[PDB]
Write a protein that binds this ligand. Structure first.
Ligand SMILES: [Fe+3]
Ligand SMILES: [Zn+2]
Lengths: 385, 43, 300, 575
């Protein structure tokens, strides 16, 4: 069991809704997505604090369909630290933006060289200012957009993920999956297109996808029916010939909504996979598909109330989950601002209160320490062990 | 049986049409989930 | 006539999808300032183009280059394309350059206040950045013909019929120079649409009036006409007939909204006055290819 | 004044990339005037893609203006700052700059600063640093002390063993040319181990890069030893799990064959090539099929024929019938290219059935690609053996609902006419030329007219006069004004090739008749037509007929007719 310590709240009504939380691979910097395009970034104090902020997207009004596309950054993903400047992938409903957050490198240089407005010539315009403007040395972190991805997703975007080899990253919308090269942002390879020719028969919605963390070729994409398909780009260029399908008395009207898997994450070791359906967190060993190795219940009392949650909007809520860096434990959110940690070692589950009514939709786990970050709607919590 | 579920077919349609007015139009996930819950015409 | 050869150079510049300077477009627009625009028998009639500039270049490739080929456009060229301003400039350029071989008809999407409520002002801000360009682009609307009465035989416009306008003589009394709020025949005549049901109707849009086979027979036999050619709304297969050859709709923007699979067409009118719809597919432009099942070179 | 631009780069602050760039890109006078001493270069460090690229582009030239052999090491910290940036293109230019100055560094400077710079870049844990170093080793090794020659290979091995996959990608990428200058025994003993590690790396992006390294390594080492040294790694690469590696092996297959020689090709590559053409991935079949022509032409002439018929051509049978559009199109582009090898007998046995099969594909691209390369078959057997089966494919292509297919075939008619010859083209296809002239799509009419010009060029004057001109003029009678206008464009382009005699005597009168056409379009296109052909027309006939008719048009009611008629007379100097 892990004795989690209550988080300090550092961040904090409609634009400020944390739609994603994500630690960098070496977890020093924490970037949180938003429903207002402001990716609030924090970083761990060198032995977390507000680091920077950048407007990843504006309300891009589509003029071909008149759809008032929101600035909803549904995913934040870090890249490896190519240089001193860190990079972040931010994806709104329609388009991805690659960002560079660099410190002020020229702080000393700007102080070491300065002349008059006319390059030390007489009759300078701002004669005093030049005497003082020479002191530009500052410690602030400077955000900057590097590469703009194209408008490829004809539908709301739900997932992106950096591949194990840092040339490409995954992008999946509710109907298709496109593979984006990191620097080559003018084109994308549509690796999966489940779209039925006639939208009448729309049964399958790709609700989430990710890349296998250690294998550059293995990736999984969920489905509305819960059938998690583990694809392998080694088999073929197009991944419609999926390698495996993961699938499991109570067959109510809403069997078609409880079976929808809102989130899928691989273990840090890539030995196990954890899929969050509405009611249960299913943990699958990747070599056995007809059942999970362990099934976990996220909330017992909500199984019968599928009309009441359907009169309300609550039953559509997208929940997510995350693993320990050691994979020994997993954690996911529940309603009423409660999240649950499902320890696979002792099979003991401990629920935790963040401080129905409030939903912990998104959360994250630091890949090197028992640090977890929680995306409450109007708050951000980083719980320690 | 007494009416506890007829609500659902009408709400199935009621949420389909209530989506088109909101920001971003249809969310195909929530729209398909709302559309798959229904009620048999006769028994 | 140096300015004329300069505009002949603007033809090349515009074809490169480059917008004219505010000075250039103003010198053109100033020199640009009827409901019965008797169009002689050989002419090409085109429907909505809605700013799909690459699809307009395609359209010229299908129909033909002007001044060689005559043109008359039912109006929709701003609101729905990435290249609104670059389309409108080419159109008015052709008009002022060839006043008697090109005709542009007032459309349903072209106004001042509702376009400001819509984004097109924002579009011009992205393209140019200021109000003057938009203003210059709007004043030409009042001086654009409302209808194209091709001849005694065939009639063509952007819209369709109206409760108040039965006889062509009524078309004559209409004023082109009228920007007034949405109510009144000024909207009806532009925004109208036909349907298989015979009678009046209304829609969730701004005020626009529909019509059926009965109203089409009243408008036709009372005028000796042969069609009511329209281009108001989207139609798949590029042209939509109605009411047994009494109303017809043309759409000239192939793949109208890039999501849609709709074909597009234009109708050539021969010397012997006869409509001949031409079918053409969207341009070979790849733009940002996301569909290409030929693996991109970065992954190979 | 003009000299201070060397220092305005950062004197302006909150700069514009255009102003910063223009302030930065002025090297000739400033390098000799101010940069000799005032730079001691921290103005040259601005962090943005275009400015960094410009800095690299300029810093590469300071060697000749600053006194390089003495001080050139002073250029290293700026290029270091440029090499460690995230931007790949900037890194590429920064490394190209460092590589340029390497040839001018003296061995003393090479040893003192340059090699320790490479060492520091490997030492710099920011993996973009390491990434940059991967390409620098190749130029310093030949002239540095044998001690350094040994020390460098240690860090290079560390690069190939680094746990950052991008580092291994770069290292493997540069290992090819690096092996070209390393000592042969050092390549065998020191590079091959790390090369084996690269070619078997966990990440497929790493493994797929080892094959070009293998190409260069095989070009260097004695062919007799490749069978043991490199080949065991190539076998496991060509049959790798990932289709990407198989694709690259198929793509680089011509280079591989050239590097490893024909005997090893016959022993190891040909079976691998069969396994590539039969691969379950369409892309791998595409790559392999593309290279089948070059591979066959690169095999030793003794085995080539029998090897094709025994191992490749039976697989070609399956590729021609492949389920994928791209595979059929790719093979179709090259498949005829086997004809010079298999021309006399084998072409009729297998290749003709393969052609005729491809000539009936549902996709037009396949038929287009076959007809695009007929030269390979026409020179060996002759077109008569193909013409009978080419005519229906070109007819079907020329009538596609998608007019762009009709356009695409129109582009090849002169090549086709030159191959099919004078008799067959005018027997079977001239009618199709006219079918495009009248075509409803202007793009087709235009392209076909300009195409018809090229046909007249290939055939000359008397042919067109005897058969084409009598037909194109008949389009003047068409009630559709667009067809008359097409007659004017046709007359225009023909006048250039058919010359003044045929133009003025036989053809020209038709233009005057439609000058008074009731449609102003035909009238001013007559004006523009005479304006273009006018310089070819005889002054006597120009004055007798062109001048008074053009003058008549200058007084028309139509301003467009009057405008163009005046412009014509002006250009013709008649009035
Ligand atoms: Fe319209
Ligand atoms: Zn309209």
């Amino acid at each position: 069991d892990i004795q989690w310590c209550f988080s300090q709240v550092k961040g904090a009504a409609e634009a400020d809704i944390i739609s994603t939380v994500e630690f960098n691979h070496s977890g020093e910097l924490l970037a949180t997505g938003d429903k207002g395009g402001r990716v609030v970034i924090f970083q761990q104090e060198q032995e977390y604090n507000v680091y920077s902020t950048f407007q990843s997207h504006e309300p891009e009004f589509d003029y071909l369909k008149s759809l008032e596309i929101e600035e909803k950054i549904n995913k934040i993903r870090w890249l490896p630290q190519k240089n001193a400047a860190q990079f972040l992938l931010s994806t709104n409903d329609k388009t991805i933006k690659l960002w560079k957050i660099s410190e002020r490198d020229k702080r000393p240089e700007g102080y070491n060289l300065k002349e008059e407005d006319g390059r030390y010539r007489d009759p300078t315009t701002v004669t005093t200012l030049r005497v003082p403007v020479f002191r530009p040395m500052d410690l602030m972190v400077e955000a900057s957009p590097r590469r703009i991805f194209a408008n490829a997703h004809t539908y709301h975007i739900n997932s992106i993920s950096i591949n194990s080899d840092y040339e490409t990253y995954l992008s999946a919308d509710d109907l298709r999956i496109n593979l984006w090269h990191l620097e080559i942002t003018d084109r994308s390879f549509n690796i999966v297109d489940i779209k039925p020719a006639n939208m009448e028969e729309l049964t399958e919605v790709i609700t989430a996808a990710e890349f296998h963390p250690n294998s550059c070729n293995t990736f999984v994409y969920s489905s509305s029916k819960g059938t998690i398909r583990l694809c392998d780009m080694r088999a073929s260029a197009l991944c419609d010939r999926h390698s495996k399908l993961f699938e499991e008395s109570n067959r109510s009207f809403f069997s078609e909504i409880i079976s929808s898997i809102s989130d899928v994450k691989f273990s840090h070791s890539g030995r196990y996979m954890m899929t969050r359906d509405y009611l249960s967190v299913k943990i699958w060993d990747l070599n056995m598909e007809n059942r999970p190795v362990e099934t976990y219940q996220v909330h017992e009392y909500l199984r019968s109330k599928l009309c009441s949650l359907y009169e309300n909007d609550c039953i559509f809520d997208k929940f997510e989950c995350c693993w320990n860096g050691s994979d020994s434990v997993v954690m996911t959110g529940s309603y009423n601002n409660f999240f649950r940690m499902f320890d696979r070692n002792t099979k003991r589950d401990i629920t935790l209160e963040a401080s129905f009514n409030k939903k912990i939709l998104h959360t994250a786990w630091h890949p090197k320490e028992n640090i977890i970050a929680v995306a409450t709607t109007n708050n951000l919590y980083i719980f320690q062990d | 049986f007494k009416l506890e579920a007829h609500r659902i077919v009408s709400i199935s349609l009621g949420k389909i049409y209530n989506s088109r007015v909101q920001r971003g139009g249809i969310k195909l996930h929530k729209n398909l989930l709302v559309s798959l819950v229904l009620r048999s015409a006769r028994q | 006539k140096v300015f004329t050869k300069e505009l002949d150079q603007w033809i090349e510049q515009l074809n490169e999808c480059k917008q004219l300077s505010e000075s250039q477009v103003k010198s053109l627009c100033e020199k640009a300032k009827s409901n019965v625009q008797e169009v002689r028998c050989p002419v090409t009639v085109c429907g909505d183009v809605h700013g799909q500039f690459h699809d307009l270049m395609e359209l010229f490739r299908i129909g033909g280059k002007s001044p060689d080929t005559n043109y008359l456009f039912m109006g929709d060229y701003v609101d729905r394309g990435y290249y609104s301003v670059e389309t409108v400039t080419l159109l008015v350029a052709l008009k002022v350059r060839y006043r008697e071989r090109i005709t542009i008809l007032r459309g349903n999407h072209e106004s001042r206040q509702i376009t400001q409520v819509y984004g097109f002002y924002d579009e011009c801000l992205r393209k140019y950045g200021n109000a003057n360009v938009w203003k210059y682009f709007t004043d030409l609307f009042d001086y654009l013909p409302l209808t194209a009465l091709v001849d005694g035989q065939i009639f063509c416009l952007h819209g369709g019929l109206s409760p108040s306008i039965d006889t062509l003589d009524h078309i004559r009394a209409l004023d082109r120079l009228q920007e007034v709020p949405h109510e009144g025949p000024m909207c009806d005549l532009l925004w109208s649409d036909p349907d298989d049901r015979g009678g009046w109707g209304i829609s969730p849009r701004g005020a626009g009036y529909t019509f059926g086979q009965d109203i089409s027979e009243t408008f036709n036999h009372a005028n000796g006409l042969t069609l009511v050619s329209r281009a108001h709304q989207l139609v798949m297969e590029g042209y939509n007939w109605c009411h047994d050859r009494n109303v017809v709709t043309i759409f000239s923007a192939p793949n109208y909204c890039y999501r849609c699979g709709n074909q597009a067409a234009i109708m050539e009118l021969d010397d012997t006055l006869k409509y001949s719809f031409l079918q053409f597919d969207p341009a070979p432009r790849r733009g940002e290819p996301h569909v290409t099942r030929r693996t991109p070179d970065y992954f190979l | 004044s003009l000299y201070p631009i060397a220092v305005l780069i950062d004197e302006l602050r909150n700069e514009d990339v255009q102003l910063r760039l223009n302030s930065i890109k002025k090297l000739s006078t400033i390098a000799l005037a101010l940069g000799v001493e005032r730079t001691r270069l921290t103005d040259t460090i601005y962090d943005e893609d275009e400015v960094l690229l410009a800095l690299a582009e300029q810093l590469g030239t300071f060697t000749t203006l600053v006194g390089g052999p003495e001080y050139v090491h002073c250029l290293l910290p700026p290029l270091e700052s440029l090499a460690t940036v995230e931007e790949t293109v900037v890194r590429d230019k920064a490394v190209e700059s460092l590589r340029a100055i390497s040839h001018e560094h003296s061995p003393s400077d090479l040893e003192a600063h340059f090699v320790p710079l490479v060492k520091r870049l490997a030492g710099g844990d920011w993996f973009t640093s390491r990434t940059s170093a991967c390409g620098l080793f190749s130029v310093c090794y030949p002239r540095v002390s044998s001690a350094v020659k040994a020390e460098l290979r240690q860090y290079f091995r560390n690069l190939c063993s680094d746990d950052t996959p991008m580092v291994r990608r770069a290292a493997a990428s540069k290992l090819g040319e690096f092996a070209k200058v390393l000592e042969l025994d050092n390549v065998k003993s020191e590079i091959i181990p790390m090369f084996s590690n690269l070619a078997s790396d966990e990440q497929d992006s790493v493994r797929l890069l080892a094959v070009e390294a293998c190409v260069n390594i095989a070009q260097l080492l004695p062919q007799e030893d490749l069978e043991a040294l490199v080949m065991p790694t190539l076998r496991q690469a060509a049959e790798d799990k990932s289709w990407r590696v198989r694709y690259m092996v198929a793509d680089k297959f011509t280079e591989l064959q050239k590097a490893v020689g024909p005997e090893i090709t016959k022993t190891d590559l040909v079976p691998a090539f069969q396994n590539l053409m039969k691969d379950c991935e369409a892309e791998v079949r595409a790559a392999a099929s593309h290279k089948v022509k070059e591979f066959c032409e690169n095999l030793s002439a003794d085995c080539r024929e029998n090897v094709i018929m025994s191992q490749i051509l039976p697989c070609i049978k399956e590729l021609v019938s492949d389920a994928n559009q791209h595979v059929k199109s790719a093979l179709a582009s090259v498949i005829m290219g086997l004809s010079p090898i298999l021309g006399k007998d084998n072409t009729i046995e297998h290749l003709l059935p393969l052609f005729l099969a491809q000539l009936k594909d549902e996709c037009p691209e396949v038929r287009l690609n076959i007809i695009s390369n007929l030269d390979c078959v026409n020179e060996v057997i002759g077109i008569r053996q193909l013409s009978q089966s080419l005519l229906p494919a070109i007819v079907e292509l020329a009538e596609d609902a998608k007019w762009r297919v009709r356009l695409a075939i129109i582009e090849y008619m002169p090549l086709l006419a030159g191959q099919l010859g004078v008799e067959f083209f005018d027997e079977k296809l001239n009618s199709l030329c006219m079918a495009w002239l009248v075509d409803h799509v202007y793009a087709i009419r235009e392209a076909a007219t300009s195409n018809l010009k090229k046909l007249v060029e290939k055939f000359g004057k008397e042919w067109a006069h005897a058969t084409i001109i009598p037909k194109v003029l008949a389009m003047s009678g068409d009630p559709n004004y667009l067809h008359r206008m097409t007659t004017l464009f046709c007359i225009n382009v023909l006048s250039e090739v058919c010359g003044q005699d045929i133009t003025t005597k036989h053809m020209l009168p038709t233009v005057l008749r439609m000058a008074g056409d009731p449609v102003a379009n035909v009238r001013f296109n007559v004006a523009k037509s005479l304006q273009k052909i006018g310089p070819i027309l005889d002054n006597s006939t120009l004055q007798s007929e062109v001048k008074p008719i053009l003058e008549k048009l200058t007084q028309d009611q139509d301003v467009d007719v009057k405008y163009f008629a005046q412009e014509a007379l002006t250009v013709l100097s008649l009035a």
